[model samples]
Target: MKLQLVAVGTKMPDWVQTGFTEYLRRFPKDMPFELIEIPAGKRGKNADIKRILDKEGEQMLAAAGKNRIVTLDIPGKPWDTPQLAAELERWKLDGRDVSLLIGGPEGLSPACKAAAEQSWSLSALTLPHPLVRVLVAESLYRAWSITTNHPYH
Candidate 1:
């Protein structure tokens, strides 16, 4: 199954880019992973958070297409490495693309959350956007490794 990580941001730091790319390249050719970046909406210090989330949510939904949607959220379900590997296997058996959505600074809009079939929480503590990218990529790679019984784990 093809995996697409759609995030609301652009121009990450070099370390973030390299970290994500490194894990991406480790995947087998059959199960390819890609990243789709959406431009962030304008938001001043005191700007309305709802407006920005709505705008970004629209783009994220568009990028998701008909794939199985999974949004990263604070109050979402938390899965362990083994569970993720099983989930990945199930997605592969279903033969459908998987789209993982990452929200912006303010968080995901209600529409985005409603659209997703599942919500995943990485951790309890807040993490930077760039770090989240790396973590997602690495976790996916690790999950893939576990599914294949690779020694990388």
Candidate 2:
């Protein structure tokens, strides 16, 4: 199954790309994991983060197609590696792709949050969205490896 990251932002800084690429290169090419970032919203004194989130959420849902939606939020479930692996396996077996949404500074819109079938939390501490992408990718890779009983994991 495919794994897609729907984020709201422009081209991440070099460090972000480097961090993400480090883990991304570990996954197999056929896994079909990808990152799709919507351009950051306009800059202004009243720069509307909510509007940016809404627009990004719409784009994400469209790209996800019929895939299962999972929003990463502070109030969501906190899963261990084994649990995440099991869930990943179940989704794979069911032939469902996974779309993970990482919102902007203000967080996900209510509509996007409502659309998600499941909400997950990586940690209680707030993190930069670019860093969140790297962490999520790494966790997912680890979970995938665990499902296959890969020794390295």
Candidate 3:
């Protein structure tokens, strides 16, 4: 199965890239993983949140193609590792690409949320955007390990 992580940010720190690459490289060639970074919208005390979100959302949606979208949002449903494994299997069986959307600091826009087939919440506590990249990659690797009985979970 092909997996894509579409996030609204650019120029992540080296540590974040290193951490994300470590987990990403663990996957087999058949189950390819791709990370697409969209330039983040401008932020300021007077910046228009809606405009920024809308621009980011459009870029995200365009990168997603026809894949099944899974947006990460605070109000999304929380899934355990086992559940993630099961869902992974289901997506593979369906033979469709899966896209995971990570919004900017202010969160997903209305259009982005509405486009997603599933909404997932990584944690209740607020997490740094860079940290989220590593976490998501690790979680995906763990879920794959669990499904394949690789003993990494």
Off by over 4 Å in 2: 47-49
Better of 2 and 3 by TM-score: 3
For residues 31-106, write the lDDT of model 3, one tens digit per residue.
9988999999878899998998999999999999899999988788888999989889888888789999998788
Winner by TM-score between candidate 2 and candidate 1: 1
Find the 10 residues in a row with the least total lDDT in model 1: 87-96
* Model 2 C-alpha lDDT per residue in residues 122-143, reported as the tens digit of each score: 9999988988999998898899
- Give lDDT for model 2: 0.82
Listing every candidate in turn, what is its Cα RMSD in Å to the true structure after a full C-alpha superposition? 1.2, 1.6, 1.1
Tens-digit lDDT track of model 1 for 1-153: 899999999979898899889998888998999999999987889988898889999999999999999988888878899998988888888778999999977889989999989888999988788888888889989999998888999
Error of 3 at 44 (Å): 4.6
In candidate 1, position 35 carries an lDDT of 95
Say which candidate scores most in lDDT: 1
Query: In candidate 2, how many clashes are counted?
Result: 0
lDDT of 3: 0.89
